[model samples]
Target: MVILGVGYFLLGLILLYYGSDWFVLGSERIARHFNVSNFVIGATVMAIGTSLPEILTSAYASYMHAPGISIGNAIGSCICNIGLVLGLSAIISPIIVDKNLQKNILVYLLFVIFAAVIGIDGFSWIDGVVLLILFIIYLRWTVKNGSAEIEKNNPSVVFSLVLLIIGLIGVLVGAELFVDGAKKIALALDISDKVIGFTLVAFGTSLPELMVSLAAAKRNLGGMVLGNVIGSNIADIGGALAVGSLFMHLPAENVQMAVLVIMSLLLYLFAKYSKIGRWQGILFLALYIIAIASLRMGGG
Candidate 1:
């Protein structure tokens, strides 16, 4: 079983690697067909596509009454995406923020801050409904923003859609296998559900975001990297958590949510400078380490 667990982990890692490549390639092609900017496609379609792992995992966890895993995985993935994905992407190559992308980044910061406060008592179904409405607004607004600046070049369709669908399936399946394996191993070690969700499960699910960001960054598609990061966070906390909340009341995990809020603030502040450089990356990575270590020790 332990061997199987390790196998799942490595297999998921491999899937996420190629899956992200294919996903980004396909999405870029599709974006060209619609004359949409990469930033827009990255923020809307690509963001939600890559976020499927978190959505499914959180929803499933809540359905099974592991509510801790539900909220923990959702909010924890937000932290992982911002801290690990963005941090590494910037260090590899500083991500230059376009004037427009900063608008969505600001919106994402608001979503994170709202998430931090909304569930202090717990998430009722009404709260879930409210989040859903807000997410719909965000999606519409993002699509509108993308439409404002059209940059159409390529017009391929069938092949790109096929690649997009396949890549999406790969990442979703890969995340399930990875989380199942990680949960098994963690269970053997007697880790609590919330801890498992916040650490291994959250990290596992965030791998897709990390992989996609690195791939985009390597190709100098900084808009896509930042767009996907910010958009995915909105999707995870706003969209996915909303779905989870409908199933049951999800605990707020105050300190963890606070971490996400602080990171969001830092991102908003740094982003105003118009670029995320290596220094910001280093600081983000350092802060992430501290947050995780402290969480592990605090143990709720």
Candidate 2:
């Protein structure tokens, strides 16, 4: 099955690029046809873009009694050290980095503050609405700028309607076969499965965050990480990522809250100077170190 695992893994990547791509295109056509604000459309594309798999997969997987998937997303992202990506972005270009990344962190900071205040395992409907409104707040931020466009494209709406069908399948089935191979490979290797899930598959699911954040640094594609971060992470809160079985474990929750605090203070200091480059990336590296140390202290 080594061959099987490799095939599925490669197939997954192919599907994801195609999946993420078509999904955006389909939505773009539909939104443009409807004359929706590009800001809103752009927000949806960013927020719902790659993160869709995290929510769809985690939501259904949790309902299917597969708690492992949820762990990889919620705590997986929580434990994965987002700052490394943020710091890497800092090192590349500070000017845009200060504006875009800090704006994202500022929004994410509010969610953490809200999470601590609500302090519940289950996200009641109110909690769901809270997240939605924050997104709306982001929308307001965009529109208030008065520069947002409502694009009118010449694409056929039915083509877009049908485009969604194919794109949805690409994403759903692609994610399905994609991670299945990872499991098959892990099964071939060992018996202590939780370790693998927490390490390999865990970080793998968090791939959406890293993918977008890296894109932010590599292409200087400012602001999409927040869409991926705030949009997806908060949507996870509404879905099952946080409220799933992973949060049922106390220490994982410890890491969730811990990282939020670290980002708030650590990034705050960097913000004062509008300098998110050198020290930002390196200190964020230290941020990752603290998580490893925390696991050592909390290890079972």
Candidate 3:
């Protein structure tokens, strides 16, 4: 079982390596051709693209009667991306924010808090309705407040379409592979499904966000860096959760949901301070370590 776990971890890394490459390349290509800002692309397409693995895995987990898997994967992945991935990226090389992107981040943060507060006590069927309502509102707001200057600066329509299609398929297939590989290892080790969702699954899903930023930074696309980080955060907390909330039909009072809300609030506070420094990174790492320890210790 230990050997299987190691193998699964390695497989996730390998898939992540290739998946990140494919996603980054395809995302940039789409961004260029559409002449749309990468943030716009990421918020719409790339977010869903990189998140395919989580979406599929969570759905499977939900189907298998593991609410924790769906809940933890959805909420924990959001916290992981913002707190760890974004924080680490900033520490590696401080990301430059576009004021436009900053405005959107603030909006997303507020919306997430609203959702958490309303749903925190326990989600009901109405929670799904509210999420869908918010989702629509957010979409409308995005389109209305969107920058046409970005589109005027993008590439050809044909090129963008091609990349989008290719990128979608890459993400979808990669997600299927990830879920299959992860399940085998988790089952072999007698590991709780939720732990797998929280750690390996969360990390696997976050790989694209991490790699995309690193590659963009190397090219000195500084403006896009922060936007991508924050854009991904919005997608995770807002868009991804919307999907899970709609489908899983779970209450917000689920212990897993409480953990997610807490984790997200902590990270949101850190981000609100404008940058997550080394100390912030250390703090997040320490806290998440304790969280993981407690979960494992408690046998869930």
Candidate 4:
């Protein structure tokens, strides 16, 4: 039985890797067809696609009445996105900050702050509504600000749509299998649900972001890389958590919440100053390691 679980887990990882790549390719092609800038596509479609796993995991955890898993996954994925995903990408090459990204960064900070505030007591339906409203406002803002005129590439919409649908199926299936296997392993290992959510599940779900960011870095799409990270982080906390709240009340873990607040500030400073060099990446990765060690010791 354990072997079977491990098999599913490995299969899920493979699916997530290729699935995210397919999603990114399809999204970029569609964006080109519509004359949307890579920056905008990265921030919106790519970010959302990569974050789909975390979002689905959170929802499933909540549905299963595991609020700790849901909340922990949301917070943990954000930290992982900035510390690991963006950190590695930046280390591969310096990510130049565009002036246009400053606004989106500001928005990301606001979402983080809002998520922190609402989760102070516990996530509720009210919190869900507030976050959903904010998400709607965010979408509207993106539509208005991101409609840049570019030369069309005239890509095949049908092919792009097919790729997107198949990619989504793979991602969703992989997330379900991965979460199930992680939960089983947590029980077998006597690991707390919070710990499982914060570490293994968080990292597993973040694979999509890591792969997509690496691809963006390789292409020298600095704006897209940074945008995808920031946008996905925002969606994890704001969108995913909000949806989770609608199903179950998710209590905030104080230590994790504190770390999240600190990381959010650090991410803002890094982006605002364009200090995403290799050294900064090393610092973030080191901090993340310390944080995980502390969390493990604290057994949260």
Candidate 5:
């Protein structure tokens, strides 16, 4: 049974990586077809696309009456996207931040703070409404700042659309498999569902962001990389949490709350510094380890 769980975990990772690749590629092609800026694409389409796994996983968990998993997965994915995904991207290649990106980062920091405050207790209908409002405001800002006009030559529209559909389907399936395996492992190991959600399930959902960040770094699309990571984090709280709350009140564990607040502060500082090197990447990874250790020790 353990071996089968491990097998499913590995399968999910493989699928998510390839699925992200296809999704990003298709998104880029579609952006070109529509003359949409890469920043816009990454911040909107690609961000939402890569976050599909988290949204679906949280929604399903909430529907299953597993509020701990839903809440843990949402917060953990945000922390992972910033700390792990962005950290790795910087290690791969130094990210150059512009003024607009800096402003976006600041906004994201504010969002994180706001989310932590409300989510400390639990996310209810009012919290969900507030989050959705914040998301709309961010969307408006992104469109105003990121959109542009360019010539369109859509030769591969059909192909891109097909790839987008297939990639999304693959990612959703992978998330389901990964969540199932992680739940099994949690039961076998006598770990709480919150711990499993924060670690394994969060990591699984975050695979798409990691892949997209690496791909963007390779292409020197730093904006896209940052956009995808930041946008996904925002969506994890504002979008995924909102959807999950519609089904159930998502509550956070004590450890999860503490980790969320601390990670948010750390991630904000990292983005403000905007000079992530190998050492910084290692530190970020270490922070993740500490978060897990603290959670376990706290019996969360």
Candidate 6:
């Protein structure tokens, strides 16, 4: 079986570009229809909506006993969202980081990093419960800005909800199909299983956040852009990892864990004092380039 690496990459990229656009359009429509702030939409409905890809992709990988692919994709996406998406957004136009969500994002980021360190053991009910609690917390955070009373009188809420439902299903179905295609392609290419976990497969999985963030930046939704970046890392690590580990033991090398710890610490400080500018974006882009180079050239 010849590896259709380029074909698969391009296919995934196209689907990623389209799916993200569709989802973002629907999200924006819903936000406008409901008169909800973009921040609330992005964090609650839009965040989960975009994350459907990650959940479906990771879940499928885990159930198939391909924990490395599934788990690695999640981790890779976590780093990518922070480094690639945020960095690129900043480079395009400086994003405004919200001080309001700073403390909240930090707390969730710590939980996710801690979970990674402990090596999320076998999937358990406890993890499931924690995930539920997390959903609630995030939901509450979203509802705080649901003061769009004008939307309550508008006739578009029902239609918007329908769009949201359809968009969610579209992402889940598309993700599974795309991942299967990519997996076959990866095998043919001999994509150094671990590295594929990081780059090839993970890029597709992280597509939702990438699209949503770009939209937020384009619209100058400063808070959404800021919240989405930090909030997403928390969700990917917290929500994604929790779900993935619930079904299997996610393996991580010591270096992987250490890097997460160090990065998390740095992110904490960055979140505290860093204003996330073009300079920071360049720094993150450089870091990712180095990381990819290391993954490809340094090890098995």
Find the candidate with the highest lDDT and give its number.
Answer: 1
Residue pairs clashing, model 2: none
Q: What would the per-residue lDDT of candidate 1 be over residues 132-244, giving only the tens digit for each residue?
A: 78888998898887775643423368889888888777776777677776766766677638543555777777777888888888887777887888889888877788899
Worst 10 residues of 5 by lDDT: 291-300
lDDT of 3 by residue, 11-36 (tens): 65565555555555666666665466
Full-model lDDT for every candidate: 0.80, 0.53, 0.58, 0.75, 0.74, 0.63
Expressed as tens digits, the lDDT of each residue in 76-170 for candidate 2 is 45445345545565566452334444554566567666764554453444554565566556656643542335544345977886675576566
Error of 5 at 145 (Å): 1.0
Candidate 5, residue 136: how far the Cα is off, in Å: 2.4
In order of TM-score, best first, we have 1, 4, 5, 6, 3, 2
lDDT tens digits, residue span 109-159, model 4: 878777777677888978888887887678668756767665442348888
- Number of clashing residue pairs, candidate 1: 0
lDDT of 3: 0.58
> Of 3 and 6, which scores higher on lDDT?
6
Q: Model 6, residue 256: displacement in angstroms?
A: 2.9
Worst 10 residues of 4 by lDDT: 291-300
Question: Compared to the true structure, candidate 2 yields what TM-score?
Answer: 0.67
| Model 4 pairs in collision | none
lDDT of model 2, residue 270? 66
- State the lDDT at 236 in candidate 3: 56
